[PDB]
Design a protein around this ligand. Structure first.
Ligand SMILES: C[C@H](CSSC[C@@H](C)C(=O)N1CCc2ccccc2[C@@H]1C(=O)O)C(=O)N1CCc2ccccc2[C@H]1C(=O)O
Ligand SMILES: [O-]
Ligand SMILES: [Zn+2]
Ligand SMILES: [Zn+2]
Length: 229
């Protein structure tokens, strides 16, 4: 089940895959959970998303050292907001190579984030340009179009039934999407559907602010995003 490690929660999702969860008390919004992923690829570990803070992200690295005890070869972060990139400095202090969408790196300063060290770029069809994502192992990175933000990216894990939608995807019982100022209202619905089509066989949809869900999370997020266009 859930594994409490200090103020963080870790949950094994598949043999080589764990979800990390961290919390931030946001005035006016309560204590908000954010989820990312940890993947073991042979003798190395790959991280998807930081925690909200540097201190929490250092604790993720501490958990990895205790439960896996292999080097963290790289981290990929899925857009320039605090839940996904708030802990970049902790990754850099630990010597970990970091990757984000070029657009996330461009937006990072004005969003109050530290940029990743390397920039991913994407083909017109959304798949990462392979030269920009060297040694990514099973991580299959896809840009579905603007939605939750202009720069949001998504990640499939080869050899598993898991795809990670980040903050683009909400769960199948979610009530709304909100009126968030960074969202692309014109394109959000198509981007959600493009994520589902990019990972057509993934049956476990992992996301930033809900527990893992079936593919109904995609249909429901899209079906909900329709009523904004
Ligand atoms: C200063 C703080 C940073 S929070 S990360 C960027 C947010 C704008 C955002 O996109 N959120 C926030 C968290 C969240 C919680 C539940 C559903 C959806 C979200 C969404 C996301 O990551 O998908 C900040 O900007 N805010 C604080 C908290 C918060 C909570 C919920 C909605 C908006 C916000 C945001 C604010 O509008 O002040
Ligand atoms: O976010
Ligand atoms: Zn966001
Ligand atoms: Zn989020």
């Amino acid at each position: 089940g859930d594994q409490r490690f200090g103020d963080l929660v870790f949950r094994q999702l598949a043999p080589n895959v764990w979800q990390h969860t961290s919390y931030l008390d946001m005035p006016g919004f309560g204590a908000v959970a954010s989820n990312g992923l940890i993947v073991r690829d042979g003798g190395r570990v790959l991280v998807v998303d930081t925690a909200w803070t540097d201190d929490q992200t250092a604790q993720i690295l501490n958990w990895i050292k205790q439960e896996i005890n292999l080097p963290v070869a790289l981290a990929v972060v899925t857009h320039a907001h605090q839940d996904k990139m708030g802990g970049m400095d902790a990754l850099h202090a630990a010597g970990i190579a970091t990757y984000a969408n070029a657009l996330s790196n461009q937006l990072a300063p004005q969003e109050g984030m530290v940029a990743a060290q390397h920039s991913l770029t994407f083909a017109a069809n959304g798949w990462v340009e392979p030269a920009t994502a060297p040694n990514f192992g099973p991580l299959k990175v896809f840009y579905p179009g603007p939605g939750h933000t202009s720069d949001n990216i998504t990640v499939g894990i080869d050899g598993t039934d898991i795809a990670f939608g980040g903050c683009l995807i909400k769960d199948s019982k979610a009530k709304s999407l909100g009126n968030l100022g960074d969202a692309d209202t014109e394109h959000y619905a198509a981007s959600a559907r493009a994520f589902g089509a990019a990972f057509p066989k993934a049956s476990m949809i992992v996301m930033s602010h809900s527990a893992p869900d079936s593919r109904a999370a995609i249909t429901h997020t899209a079906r909900m995003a329709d009523k904004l266009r």
